[PDB]
C-alpha cells in the first residue's frame, strides 16, 4: 500500500522478453498456462502490464488490533522455547559461507543496484575466499550498521514465469524485488543464526515447512496431521503486499527483539522492508508497507507472519479460543490448518477482511468447506497420498503438464532431471505418459523404477 512517487532517475531496464520457449510436449498436453506478460505491447492482453502492477498499492492498514500483538508474543515464546535465544549477529564470512546445515549465498543471483547497471555480478563485488567487500560496498555496509539505509534502492521488475491464461489475459504479472548485495548480506548477518535453526526443524510445533524436502518430510507432515480430526486448506490473496508497517513493528518488538537474542540493528533492517525505495525504468518510488521479495529471508518472514495472522483471525472470530486448539503448517503464504474443532473460515474471512488480509477457499470457487481432511488439502501444489506407513507428495497433473510444456534453452536436461523426482509419485503409467513426448523425439529419461528406487533409498 501507499505508493509515493519520487523524482525520476537513470533508466534501469525492466526485462520485456520471456526466456521460456515451448517444448515438444506443449502441443500434446495443451495446458492453460503461458509465459507472463512483460511488455506493454504484448498482443495477448488488452491491459498495460505496468498499469496493472502500479494500479495496486492502495493503502495498508495504519492501525492493527491488539490481538495481533498478543498472539505474536505468544507464538514467539513457543518458537524461542524450542530453538533458544542465541540468535546473535553472524560475521560476513559466516553469512557468505553459511553455517553448518545451511546453504551459502548463491553467487549466480543478481547483486542489485548499482552493480547490475554497471554490468557486475556478486563475485565481482566480493571475494568469497577472504570475505572482502570492495571499498564502495564496504562503506555502504558500514552506513547500514550506523542506522542508515537511505542508499538502498530495490531493483524492481516483472517476474518471467508461467501464469494461468486468465492472468496472462489480464496482464497480472508478479513483481520481483532485488535488493543490493550488501542489504542481502546484512539480512543474513542479522537473521541467519535464527534461520539456520528455524530451517532445520520443520513441523507442527514450529508451525513451518521452511527448509523441508517433500520426498522425506511428507511422511513427517502426514503422520503429524494424521491424528487430527480435520485439516483445512487456506490461501491468501496478495499476502506479501498486504503486510502493514504495523506488522513489521510487531515483529521487531515482540518476535525479533533484543530480549529474544537478536542484534539491535534488526529493527532498522525490518524498517527497510517496511518502507522500501524502488526503481523501475526511470521511475523511482517509495512503498510504505508490504514485504519485498528477494534473498532467503522472505519465506521465513511470511511463515512467521502467517502463524500470527491466521490465529489472530480465529481469536477475533471465535471467543474463548485457545492458541493450541489449532496446529499450523505453512510455507510462506501457503497455509494449512490442523485441528480437532470444526471451524468456519467464511466468518474468519470477514474478520480478517477488516484487518487488511484477504483469504480464499483455494482452489475451488468461493465458500469454505466446514468438513475437510488431510487427503482433501493441497500444500505446495502437492497432495498427501498415503502408501503404507509413508506419505507421498503427489503433484498436480495440470501442474506437471504445464512444467513440461515450456522450458529455458540451455538447461533442459537439468529441468527434466528434477521433474522425474516430482512425477515419480504419480505412478509408472502417468510417469511414462508425461515423458512420452520427449521419448518420441529421441530424448532419454531415467526409468520409473530407477527414480522410484532412489526415493525409497532415502528411507533406509
UniProtKB/Swiss-Prot annotation:
Cleaved signal peptide residues: none
RdRp catalytic domain sequence ranges: 229-347
Places the protein is found: Host cytoplasmic vesicle membrane
Membrane topology listed for this record: Peripheral membrane protein
Active site: 235 (for rdrp activity), 333 (for rdrp activity)
Superkingdom, natural source: Viruses
Job of this protein: Replicates the genomic and antigenomic RNAs by recognizing replications specific signals. Performs VPg uridylylation.
Designated name of the protein: RNA-directed RNA polymerase
Organism of this sequence: Mengo encephalomyocarditis virus
Upper classification of the organism: Viruses, Riboviria, Orthornavirae, Pisuviricota, Pisoniviricetes
Covered range of the whole protein: 1834 to 2293 of 2293
Amino acid at each position: 500500500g501507499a505508493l509515493e512517487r519520487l523524482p525520476d532517475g537513470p533508466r534501469i531496464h525492466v526485462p520485456r522478453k520471456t526466456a521460456l520457449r515451448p517444448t515438444v510436449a506443449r502441443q500434446v498436453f495443451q495446458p492453460a498456462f503461458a509465459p507472463a506478460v512483460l511488455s506493454k505491447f504484448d498482443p495477448r492482453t488488452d491491459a498495460d502490464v505496468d498499469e496493472v502492477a502500479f494500479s495496486k498499492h492502495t493503502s495498508n492498514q495504519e492501525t492493527l488490533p491488539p490481538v495481533f500483538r498478543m498472539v505474536a508474543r505468544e507464538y514467539a515464546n513457543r518458537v524461542f522455547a524450542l530453538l533458544g535465544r542465541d540468535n546473535g549477529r553472524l560475521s560476513v564470512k559466516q553469512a557468505l559461507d553459511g553455517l553448518e546445515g545451511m546453504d551459502p549465498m548463491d553467487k549466480n543471483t543478481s547483486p542489485g543496484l548499482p552493480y547490475t547497471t554497471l554490468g557486475m555480478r556478486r563475485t565481482d563485488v566480493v571475494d568469497w575466499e577472504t570475505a572482502t567487500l570492495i571499498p564502495f560496498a564496504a562503506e555502504r555496509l558500514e552506513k547500514m550498521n550506523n542506522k542508515d539505509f537511505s542508499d538502498i534502492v530495490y531493483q524492481t521488475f516483472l517476474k518471467d514465469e508461467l501464469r494461468p491464461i486468465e492472468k496472462v489475459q489480464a496482464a497480472k504479472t508478479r513483481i520481483v524485488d532485488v535488493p543490493p548485495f550488501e542489504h542481502c548480506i546484512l539480512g543474513r548477518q542479522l537473521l541467519g543464526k535464527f534461520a539456520s535453526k528455524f530451517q532445520t526443524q520443520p513441523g507442527l510445533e514450529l508451525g513451518s515447512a521452511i527448509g523441508c524436502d517433500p520426498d522425506v518430510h511428507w511422511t513427517a507432515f502426514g503422520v503429524a496431521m494424521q491424528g487430527f480430526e480435520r485439516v483445512y486448506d487456506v490461501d491468501y490473496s496478495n499476502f506479501d503486499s498486504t503486510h502493514s508497517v504495523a506488522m513489521f513493528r510487531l515483529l521487531a518488538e515482540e518476535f525479533f527483539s533484543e530480549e529474544n537474542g537478536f542484534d539491535p540493528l534488526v529493527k532498522d533492517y525490518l524498517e527497510s522492508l517496511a518502507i522500501s525505495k524502488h526503481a523501475y525504468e526511470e521511475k523511482r518510488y517509495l512503498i510504505t508497507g508490504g514485504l519485498p521479495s528477494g534473498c532467503a529471508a522472505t519465506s521465513m518472514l511470511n511463515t512467521i507472519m502467517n502463524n500470527i495472522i491466521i490465529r489472530a483471525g480465529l481469536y477475533l472470530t471465535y471467543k474463548n479460543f485457545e492458541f493450541d486448539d489449532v496446529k499450523v503448517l505453512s510455507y510462506g503464504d501457503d497455509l494449512l490448518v490442523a485441528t480437532n474443532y470444526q471451524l468456519n473460515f467464511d466468518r474468519v474471512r470477514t474478520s480478517l477482511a477488516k484487518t487488511g488480509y484477504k483469504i480464499t477457499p483455494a482452489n475451488k470457487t468461493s465458500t469454505f468447506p466446514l468438513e475437510s481432511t488431510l487427503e482433501d488439502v493441497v500444500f505446495l501444489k502437492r497432495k498427501f497420498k498415503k502408501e503404507g506407513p509413508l506419505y507421498r507428495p503427489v503433484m498436480n497433473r495440470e501442474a506437471l503438464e504445464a512444467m513440461l510444456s515450456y522450458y529455458r534453452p540451455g538447461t533442459l536436461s537439468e529441468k527434466l532431471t528434477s521433474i522425474t523426482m516430482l512425477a515419480v509419485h504419480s505412478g509408472k503409467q502417468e510417469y511414462d505418459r508425461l515423458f512420452a513426448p520427449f521419448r518420441e523425439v529421441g530424448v532419454i529419461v531415467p526409468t520409473f523404477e530407477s527414480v522410484e528406487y532412489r526415493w525409497r533409498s532415502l528411507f533406509w
